[PDB]
Amino acid sequence: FHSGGVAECEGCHTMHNSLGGAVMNSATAQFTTGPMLLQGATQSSSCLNCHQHAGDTGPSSYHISTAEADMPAGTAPLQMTPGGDFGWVKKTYTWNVRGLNTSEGERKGHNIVAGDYNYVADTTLTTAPGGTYPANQLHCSSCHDPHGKYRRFVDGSIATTGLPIKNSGSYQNSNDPTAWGAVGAYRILGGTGYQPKSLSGSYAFANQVPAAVAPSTYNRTEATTQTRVAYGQGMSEWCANCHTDIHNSAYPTNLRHPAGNGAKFGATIAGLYNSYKKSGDLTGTQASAYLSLAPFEEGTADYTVLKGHAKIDDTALTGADATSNVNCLSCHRAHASGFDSMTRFNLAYEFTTIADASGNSIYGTDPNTSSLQGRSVNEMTAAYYGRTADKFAPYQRALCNKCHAKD
Amino acid sequence: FHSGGVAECEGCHTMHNSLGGAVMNSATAQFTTGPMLLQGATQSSSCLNCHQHAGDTGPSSYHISTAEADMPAGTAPLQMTPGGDFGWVKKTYTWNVRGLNTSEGERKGHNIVAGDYNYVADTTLTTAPGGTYPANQLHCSSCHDPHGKYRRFVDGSIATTGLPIKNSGSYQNSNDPTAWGAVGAYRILGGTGYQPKSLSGSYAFANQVPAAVAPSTYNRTEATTQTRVAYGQGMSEWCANCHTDIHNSAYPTNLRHPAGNGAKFGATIAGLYNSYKKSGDLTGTQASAYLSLAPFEEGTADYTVLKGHAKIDDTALTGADATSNVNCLSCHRAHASGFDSMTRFNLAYEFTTIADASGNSIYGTDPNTSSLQGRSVNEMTAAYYGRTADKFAPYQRALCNKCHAKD
Ligand code: HEC
Ligand code: HEC
Ligand code: HEC
Ligand code: HEC
Ligand code: HEC
Ligand code: HEC
Numbered sequence: 065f066h067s068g069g070v071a072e073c074e075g076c077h078t079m080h081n082s083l084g085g086a087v088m089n090s091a092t093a094q095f096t097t098g099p100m101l102l103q104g105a106t107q108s109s110s111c112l113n114c115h116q117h118a119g120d121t122g123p124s125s126y127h128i129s130t131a132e133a134d135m136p137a138g139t140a141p142l143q144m145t146p147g148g149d150f151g152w153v154k155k156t157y158t159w160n161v162r163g164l165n166t167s168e169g170e171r172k173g174h175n176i177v178a179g180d181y182n183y184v185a186d187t188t189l190t191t192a193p194g195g196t197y198p199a200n201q202l203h204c205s206s207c208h209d210p211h212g213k214y215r216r217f218v219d220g221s222i223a224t225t226g227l228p229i230k231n232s233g234s235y236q237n238s239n240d241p242t243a244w245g246a247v248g249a250y251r252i253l254g255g256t257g258y259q260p261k262s263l264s265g266s267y268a269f270a271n272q273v274p275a276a277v278a279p280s281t282y283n284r285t286e287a288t289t290q291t292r293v294a295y296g297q298g299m300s301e302w303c304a305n306c307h308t309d310i311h312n313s314a315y316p317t318n319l320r321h322p323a324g325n326g327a328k329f330g331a332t333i334a335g336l337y338n339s340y341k342k343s344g345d346l347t348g349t350q351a352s353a354y355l356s357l358a359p360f361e362e363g364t365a366d367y368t369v370l371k372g373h374a375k376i377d378d379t380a381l382t383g384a385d386a387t388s389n390v391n392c393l394s395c396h397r398a399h400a401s402g403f404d405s406m407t408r409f410n411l412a413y414e415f416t417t418i419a420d421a422s423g424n425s426i427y428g429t430d431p432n433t434s435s436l437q438g439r440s441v442n443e444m445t446a447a448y449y450g451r452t453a454d455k456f457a458p459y460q461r462a463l464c465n466k467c468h469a470k471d
Numbered sequence: 472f473h474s475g476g477v478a479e480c481e482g483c484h485t486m487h488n489s490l491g492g493a494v495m496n497s498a499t500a501q502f503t504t505g506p507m508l509l510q511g512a513t514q515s516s517s518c519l520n521c522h523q524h525a526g527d528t529g530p531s532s533y534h535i536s537t538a539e540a541d542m543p544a545g546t547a548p549l550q551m552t553p554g555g556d557f558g559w560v561k562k563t564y565t566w567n568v569r570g571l572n573t574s575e576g577e578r579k580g581h582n583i584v585a586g587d588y589n590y591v592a593d594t595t596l597t598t599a600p601g602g603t604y605p606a607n608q609l610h611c612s613s614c615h616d617p618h619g620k621y622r623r624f625v626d627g628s629i630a631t632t633g634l635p636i637k638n639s640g641s642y643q644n645s646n647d648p649t650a651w652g653a654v655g656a657y658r659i660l661g662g663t664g665y666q667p668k669s670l671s672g673s674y675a676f677a678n679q680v681p682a683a684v685a686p687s688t689y690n691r692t693e694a695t696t697q698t699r700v701a702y703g704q705g706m707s708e709w710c711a712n713c714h715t716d717i718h719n720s721a722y723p724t725n726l727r728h729p730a731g732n733g734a735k736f737g738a739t740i741a742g743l744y745n746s747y748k749k750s751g752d753l754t755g756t757q758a759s760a761y762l763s764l765a766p767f768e769e770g771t772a773d774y775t776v777l778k779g780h781a782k783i784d785d786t787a788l789t790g791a792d793a794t795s796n797v798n799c800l801s802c803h804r805a806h807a808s809g810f811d812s813m814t815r816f817n818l819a820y821e822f823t824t825i826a827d828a829s830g831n832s833i834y835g836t837d838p839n840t841s842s843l844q845g846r847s848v849n850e851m852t853a854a855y856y857g858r859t860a861d862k863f864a865p866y867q868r869a870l871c872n873k874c875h876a877k878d
């Protein structure tokens with residue numbers, strides 16, 4: 065459909081609303097339409113018209129959102145992709161230990177306003193923490209550019225026009241560009257100057273489409289072999305478009321956790337990322353040092369050698385060295401997650417995995433404790449991308465430690 | 472929170488400073504941070520963010536520091552723990568007898584530099600009396616290791632890595648370690664080689680985490696039944712890390728009051744510790760010989776038999792014999808105290824308790840005398856851990872005597 069580019073216009077727009085018979089979108093009458101000529105209540109209900117299937121059982125290809133009629137109450141959104149499953153946003157949690165703890169739902173992930181569904185805009189965060197981009201006009205089309213303009217040529221340069229598009233250009237199978245026509249950026253997400261014309265003001269991107277390269281069957285479980293998404297450069301400067309203060313290359317001067325291309329890894333830190341495999345253990349051997357749950361940039365726009373990585377079978381795990389950068393995604397997840405500020409690990413209560421009664425870990429077994437924070441065991445097995453509580457020590461502690469071996 | 476280990480990283484660090492809304496620590500702007508990525512003006516204002524409650528009435532669980540807005544002027548810090556209540560440091564005293572006596576405030580206890588509060592570093596003592604560790608970089612994190620590395624296994628060995636942590640390991644309730652994962656050292660205070668990387672120089676610990684075992688409701692009054700903290704071995708060699716000359720095992724050769732594991736108690740001295748209960752009286756009977764105000768080591772790392780002691784009801788008082796050692800704490804108190812060089816008893820003026828007008832003792836009744844040295848009666852009832860002037864004879868003299876029966 066979007067083959068790196070402007071798909072099929074009618075797939076998202078009706079020029080009238082009569083496809084023979086009667087209307088094409090059941091959110092209006094015969095001859096009216098959505099805000100633009102597209103077909104939905106809002107500019108972001110047109111993508112949920114195909115990326116939210118009706119009755120799913122397990123994670124499939126795309127379909128990064130699972131319905132709420134499906135996950136009855138005490139279950140977990142079923143779409144294990146590297147961005148996340150928006151199903152999370154509508155998931156509140158309560159539990160008592162010595163008071164009334166309550167992890168809200170609208171703090172896990174970006175809220176898109178899809179009033180056609182039960183998607184509401186955020187309340188607490190009226191704007192974006194960094195710069196000021198407004199948070200009631202947060203549609204899929206804000207980060208993603210539906211009419212894929214931004215192209216990668218063969219010299220590696222990026223522009224918004226000049227030759228035809230031929231393919232996605234965002235996989236391992238994706239046939240590299242040639243002298244006659246380019247391919248499309250990592251996801252169709254928009255590069256420099258991509259203000260959507262519906263929005264009106266001064267908010268206009270400034271940094272380029274990042275560099276990265278997905279596996280090509282990116283939506284999977286991770287109990288067995290784990291998914292590895294590659295990460296070229298620029299991936300932080302890009303979120304920097306709508307968060308600005310939070311970017312930080314030089315750490316000591318700017319007191320905030322380093323993130324960017326100007327934030328190298330450290331020869332020492334790097335030694336540690338390998339050594340620390342589990343919690344209490346520091347064996348090492350790069351060949352095994354994973355890349356899922358706390359990944360890292362390679363800092364190299366060479367789509368040939370970096371496509372080198374990005375397999376979906378645990379062959380190239382291949383930790384890092386003091387050249388590797390650390391983008392915002394090494395802690396967070398772009399779409400959403402199960403953890404209060406859309407992180408990848410847990411950071412709410414001292415441990416993550418309790419020791420059952422003997423040894424071998426388990427996430428815990430009582431939904432009104434602090435080990436689980438009101439999240440039944442299946443839930444929190446899906447909060448991580450379906451990896452059992454057996455890839456962690458009986459009393460696994462917090463999980464920055466994959467870098468900072470504070471064990 | 473610190474369950475023997477690395478608690479909850481975010482509890483002490485912000486990676487940015489925006490927890491939704493606005494900032495998390497009100498000591499900086501939106502997207503800046505403390506010296507390390509933690510949240511406070513200094514590396515030791517992060518622990519006072521939870522161990523100094525706002526308005527307290529009486530001593531509670533932890534909270535070893537009571538605010539100054541609370542104790543108006545003529546009152547006493549309200550935290551009766553076995554380390555002490557830092558509230559003392561900011562307490563000067565004046566009185567006249569035949570001149571102008573003035574017991575300063577910054578001599579009672581270690582000064583931590585918490586510029587975020589009214590905590591200033593020491594002036595008179597620019598370094599530490601023993602070796603040279605500098606006394607403007609004296610943070611809670613200097614003696615205490617926030618990322619609890621040091622573990623006790625089941626063989627009793629101590630290391631800084633190798634198995635997971637499961638619990639504090641520093642109480643009577645604390646479930647002993649097992650073959651799969653260890654517990655944490657007596658307090659999280661750091662063992663061998665624990666230089667904090669902020670500090671830069673040669674100052675690097677050399678001796679191990681001591682051995683001791685607290686009661687498990689350690690913060691209490693003592694008017695009624697008295698708190699007994701147990702004391703394994705090594706407790707002096709440990710303060711020896713930052714004071715070195717002052718350690719002394721063999722007395723006659725090294726002329727300074729004996730202190731350590733190589734400093735036994737004496738069959739004669741030991742006979743005396745029991746006999747002398749009050750000042751003028753020498754009844755004896757070990758079963759009653761206390762252990763609070765002048766305690767002593769047992770010299771035994773056997774966490775089972777030494778946990779045997781350490782109750783908080785006056786059952787095991789159980790004086791000693793010529794094997795018992797004498798650590799630095801048998802005279803001093805680790806955090807602070809009300810007595811000029813942070814001791815446990817008074818050693819300023821001949822007596823401690825005057826005889827009122829009839830007999831039964833009282834600390835005295837006139838704040839400009841020498842009996843009180845400018846410390847109103849309530850004050851000096853809290854200088855001792857709330858024990859009235861009725862556990863002492865009408866004219867109680869100095870208080871080394873619990874060992875040296877110089878009465
Ligand atoms: C509305 C604006 C959106 C947005 C923001 C995205 N989609 Fe689609 N999508 C569909 C299919 C079949 C695919 C796979 C086939 C193909 O891409 O040609 C995709 C893929 C994507 C991607 C990744 C593609 C890439 O190469 O980078 C992204 C980032 C994406 N989508 C976002 C199917 C549909 C639809 C079915 C008709 C509709 C409608 C949309 N998508 C709309 C959107
Ligand atoms: C096929 C060639 C077309 C053509 C001719 C157009 N589109 Fe679409 N379009 C989509 C969305 C979500 C928007 C909203 C953008 C926003 O909110 O800012 C639009 C917008 C337009 C416009 C107005 C804005 C502009 O910059 O031009 C126009 C003139 C336009 N489109 C024409 C979504 C989609 C699709 C979803 C996958 C697809 C396919 C297309 N558009 C294709 C076309
Ligand atoms: C690039 C991949 C990123 C990353 C890693 C994050 N963002 Fe966004 N963001 C935007 C708005 C309006 C908000 C407030 C809206 C809301 O709260 O739903 C946010 C918020 C966040 C958070 C906190 C989310 C929360 O629920 O509290 C986080 C952790 C986060 N962001 C990470 C708007 C935008 C953008 C506008 C175009 C862009 C681009 C990004 N964000 C990009 C990213
Ligand atoms: C999870 C919540 C955390 C937390 C609390 C911290 N980290 Fe890291 N970080 C990484 C690198 C390479 C650095 C280098 C800083 C430098 O060496 O100049 C940092 C920086 C820090 C600091 C600075 C402390 C210092 O000694 O300067 C602190 C306090 C800190 N972080 C806390 C890299 C990583 C990771 C790589 C994948 C991960 C994961 C984390 N950090 C996670 C966290
Ligand atoms: C900053 C570095 C510090 C330091 C040096 C200490 N704390 Fe805490 N503390 C908190 C709570 C609830 C407890 C009891 C619960 C538990 O320990 O799990 C403690 C306990 C301690 C101890 C004794 C613990 C032991 O088992 O030995 C010590 C030595 C100690 N603290 C020192 C609460 C907090 C906080 C609340 C968020 C914060 C922040 C800190 N403490 C920070 C520190
Ligand atoms: C959770 C797993 C983490 C991680 C990943 C880190 N910390 Fe902290 N930390 C605290 C304090 C007071 C300091 C200052 C130490 C000093 O002054 O020397 C630090 C320091 C760090 C660093 C830099 C120093 C180092 O040796 O690494 C790093 C990389 C780091 N931390 C990561 C205080 C605390 C806490 C207070 C109770 C808690 C909880 C954590 N840290 C947890 C973590």
Ligand code: HEC
Pocket residue numbers: 577578579580581582583593596598599600604605606609613614709710711712713714799800803804805812813
């Ligand atoms: C282990 C439990 C001990 C004991 C029993 C004492 N210390 Fe310390 N000490 C350090 C520094 C820099 C000073 C000077 C700073 C200051 O004066 O505030 C001190 C001072 C003392 C004193 C005199 C205190 C006073 O106010 O005059 C006493 C009685 C004392 N110490 C006892 C530094 C350190 C350490 C650095 C890591 C460590 C460990 C200790 N001291 C340990 C202990």
Ligand code: HEC
Pocket residue numbers: 722723728729735736737740765766767797801870871873874875
């Ligand atoms: C409070 C200020 C004091 C003072 C001034 C003294 N003591 Fe004691 N000390 C203890 C033990 C077991 C010894 C053995 C020395 C030995 O027998 O070899 C000592 C040593 C001394 C001496 C040496 C005098 C001598 O005859 O060799 C002196 C002069 C001295 N101390 C003074 C044990 C204790 C305690 C056990 C809990 C306490 C309390 C004190 N001493 C307190 C003090």
Ligand code: HEC
Pocket residue numbers: 074077078079080081082083084085086
């Ligand atoms: C001016 C008044 C008209 C009239 C009378 C019609 N057209 Fe359009 N139209 C366009 C496209 C792409 C379609 C079909 C696909 C789709 O909407 O997704 C249509 C459809 C119609 C119909 C079909 C009725 C039905 O099948 O339900 C009819 C009768 C019709 N039109 C008449 C596109 C355009 C267009 C630009 C692309 C313009 C300009 C017009 N239409 C104008 C008219």
Ligand code: HEC
Pocket residue numbers: 108111112115126127128145146147148174176202203204205206207208251253282398399
């Ligand atoms: C609104 C409902 C949507 C829809 C349909 C999609 N997005 Fe996004 N998204 C963003 C980024 C940076 C990525 C790539 C990040 C990564 O690969 O880790 C994605 C990813 C996707 C995909 C495929 C990849 C995947 O799901 O892992 C798809 C199909 C997709 N998106 C569609 C960024 C944002 C964003 C803010 C930055 C917002 C809002 C959305 N996406 C919303 C939507």
Ligand code: HEC
Pocket residue numbers: 193194300303304307310311312321322323390391392393394395396405407481484485486487488489490491492493
């Ligand atoms: C690179 C520029 C970024 C950007 C744009 C964001 N992150 Fe982080 N961040 C981390 C953690 C644990 C939290 C929440 C909990 C806490 O701070 O105690 C956050 C928070 C955010 C927000 C929240 C704003 C708010 O809620 O007030 C936003 C918008 C945000 N981040 C964006 C952790 C990390 C991290 C390592 C753990 C790295 C690396 C980054 N962040 C990088 C970025």
Ligand code: HEC
Pocket residue numbers: 515518519522533534535552553554555581583609610611612613614615658660689805806
């Ligand atoms: C700075 C503000 C702090 C904070 C928050 C704490 N400490 Fe210490 N402390 C030291 C030692 C040896 C002990 C144990 C001594 C004993 O048990 O007698 C303690 C004790 C504590 C506790 C609990 C036990 C208690 O309070 O009695 C807590 C919660 C605690 N500390 C926190 C040693 C030092 C030290 C120099 C050696 C310094 C400086 C601090 N502590 C400072 C702080």
Ligand SMILES: [Mg+2]
Pocket residue numbers: 170171172173174175186189
């Ligand atoms: Mg939100």
Ligand SMILES: [Mg+2]
Pocket residue numbers: 577578579580581582593596
């Ligand atoms: Mg002092």
